[PDB]
Design a protein around this ligand. Structure first.
Ligand code: HEM
Ligand code: HEM
Ligand code: HEM
Ligand SMILES: [Fe+2]
Ligand SMILES: [Fe+2]
Ligand SMILES: [Fe+2]
Ligand SMILES: [Fe+2]
Ligand SMILES: [Fe+2]
Ligand SMILES: [Fe+2]
Lengths: 157, 160, 162, 162, 162, 161
């Protein structure tokens, strides 16, 4: 079996993108744990684990399609100091991931490929859930207050 | 099998330092528990027991080298009224402990002694972890405010 | 709710005394363990822990009275080379403790304070038991002979199995 | 507490090196598993997780010293077709890491910093063990023959129940 | 990769020393057991096994560096009739080992080699503990008297783990 | 109660031989484990422990008879590069031990001492079993080939299950 070059390019772009997502999420989790916000650190660690589960599925698929996975390059990684910056950065990265996923799903469905379309659909659903959570947390922080939101997450054990 | 007098005096000085730390930490734990800040009291108790382990291993080591540990003299022990003063006091005390530990490690390693250097290294790592915790707690209380942090640490769950 | 200064000073003196006893007992236990005598080492460790409970309850009580405990002052600490010197030193320490406890109990009960008198009574009973043990051990070693006496505490005879 | 830039840059270089090792090891594990050789895939997975722990410890230490870990820089990642190429690439990576680790521990111990030296020592021991394993495996395959060596690592079974 | 001859010869000398210690300790344990002194025999057996572990780890380390372990030559092994001679012989061999270990770790650390230095530190700590035990036992028998000391190790073991 | 010098010297030289045997066997086991042949390493370790138990019982018997065991002298220890050299060295050691054992048991039984003869018989049986195993392993290596035998004996220390 030989896949089209376009679907290989789409899969490689997704792989690179969520490798970048992995690096960003793990760094943010470490920073939050260092600052003393334990529960946020646990949630971010879980999110990173889910993300590179996605990455493993993607590389397995592209390897099955008789291609060369790309591990050398990665996109830009951004970091923030306050919680708002981290939330906004994650929002933007998963947003562009969602847009690329939709475009790739359409093209791959048109190109008589099905299984890769299904894995793209599953990834899209997971990213949608994540961005929903991020938006909820952002508006909660905006309504409540930075100090109160930080106080309700401190553990000190 | 006798050791050098300089390493013995270094060990004695560190023993006195961690004994003073023991006393200060226990007093602060009792004072915090009196006012109702339960979680801080538990953490301070645990830290006092850690400094106890420091002191016990240190006196065992100096006694092995045919020395005379002194349990007589103490350094100045300071107390605070609010949380910031006690945090600052602990920070400064094991800050100077860290400095003395580094200098002693260098001299002792240069003087052809290894095991004492190793126990000094372990103690140094522990004190570095503790001062990191103190600094992050100080930054947290500075950002949040005294009332909010105190409310976070309040338990009020006494059985009766 | 404020206590009289005399009661506070009595509590502080007793706290200092039991802290000094803590230090002396722990040092003696460590020295005996290093020498090679084990049963004496564990018994001295237990006694040090008992005096540590003494100190904890004392500081709790004085703190309840809106007082200020002091952890700076410390009495003279004495050490010995042979077993007899250690026994005599501990005997003298707890003797002084007993005398101070009796005087404080009398004054404190005379000045309308009961709970502190009760904790002093409990501490006095414990100190009396300890000094009784010290005296009987000293008589035993004097009768038996030093070498023959300490031939008993030391042992390597696989005590782990049971 | 503050750290001088030399220790920070040494730790950052080691962090990037271990990240590159993570990527290369996992890619090789996936490739070997796809080819049909299973035990090699399991061993490579374990090695990738070990380097993963290394990286986590390194970034924790960097953050403790009030530094700025970087997750952007990445070294060159190389891949191979036959088993010999993979083993040679891993051997080169480990050799470079060992040399850098030795230079770094020397420099940072000469400037009064001990804990960082200790974590460097632990990492150095682990990478030394790994390169020893790679060398002995390479000697084994060179002596035995490629096909005969591969015949002992393949297995045919359904999805393994873990 | 490959080590310089100096570290190799240091490790070989230490290996020979620990082999000689193994032989001497086991012979002393057997002789003590034959005479009826029980606990001394099992303590010496435990010491023999500890030196066995020392030799094994040293052999692994030297073999890692592409060297040739020396299992042929031995130093001088000495025996004693009474307990004092055995204790003094063990003290002598431990002192020699301690001095050689210190010189070796200094030289090895001064030439960019850390892991072997760490194994030397571990061995040094263990032998220091052993010589401390020997010294305190010698002082104890000197104070107590040979016959009275021997009377406390003859019997009364009763090992019943269950 | 003390025995004759001849039996004690026989026992002493047998003790020296067994000590040399355990040294050689342990060194060979370490070399084989380092090279990557795990199962051979396990078998060699078991054999070394067996011979070193032999040495323990022999020195116990020597001490019972009011003698002086010697732990100072040693015989020549030989090492090999490939499997064939190791097997041949072990075979030679066992052959020498068997010959000495037979001569010693005959001589010492002819002089009214049977318990030492019995321990010699037990050791003789054990060493005979060992040399039989070595011979059959050498025959297998000759029949199959150096590479095929090693491919059979190697294993991957995955430790991930
Ligand atoms: C990029 C930097 C990453 C770091 C530092 C990291 C960190 C970790 C850590 C600390 C563990 C647990 C190790 C333990 O508990 O002993 C783990 C587990 C795991 N990681 Fe990540 N992670 C990263 C991204 C990745 C990567 C690169 C992979 C590669 C496949 C991945 C997939 C997994 C999987 C499958 C597990 C096991 C989870 C399970 O068995 O349920 N994640 N990771
Ligand atoms: C000043 C020298 C001190 C020494 C040598 C010392 C020694 C010890 C040791 C070794 C333990 C055992 C802890 C464990 O096994 O986890 C212990 C427990 C304890 N310490 Fe300290 N400590 C000291 C300071 C203090 C002081 C001044 C107090 C005052 C009250 C104190 C209160 C306690 C208590 C309440 C315990 C628990 C006792 C028990 O569980 O029975 N400590 N001490
Ligand atoms: C030279 C005369 C020796 C005598 C009389 C002797 C005696 C013994 C005996 C009877 C055992 C019990 C074995 C078992 O229960 O399976 C033992 C333990 C052991 N022996 Fe020796 N042995 C000698 C030399 C050696 C040497 C040089 C080594 C080198 C490594 C060695 C390796 C071991 C090991 C690894 C153990 C077990 C230790 C453990 O499990 O942690 N033997 N010794
Ligand atoms: Fe994602
Ligand atoms: Fe401390
Ligand atoms: Fe008392
Ligand atoms: Fe690594
Ligand atoms: Fe040793
Ligand atoms: Fe044998």
């Amino acid at each position: 079996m030989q896949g089209d070059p376009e679907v290989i390019e789409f899969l490689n772009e997704q792989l690179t993108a969520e490798l970048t997502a992995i690096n960003q999420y793990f760094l943010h989790a470490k920073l939050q744990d260092h600052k003393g916000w334990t529960k946020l650190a646990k949630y971010t660690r879980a999110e990173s684990f889910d993300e590179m589960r996605h990455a493993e599925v993607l590389t397995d698929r592209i390897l099955l399609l008789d291609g060369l996975p790309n591990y050398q390059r990665l996109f830009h990684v951004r970091v923030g100091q306050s919680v708002t910056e981290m939330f906004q950065a994650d929002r933007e990265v998963e947003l562009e991931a969602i847009d690329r996923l939709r475009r790739g799903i359409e093209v791959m469905r048109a190109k008589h490929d099905i299984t890769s379309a299904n894995v793209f659909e599953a990834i899209l659903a997971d990213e949608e859930h994540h961005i929903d959570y991020l938006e909820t947390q952002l508006d909660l922080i905006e309504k409540l207050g930075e100090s109160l939101y930080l106080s309700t997450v401190i553990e000190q054990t």
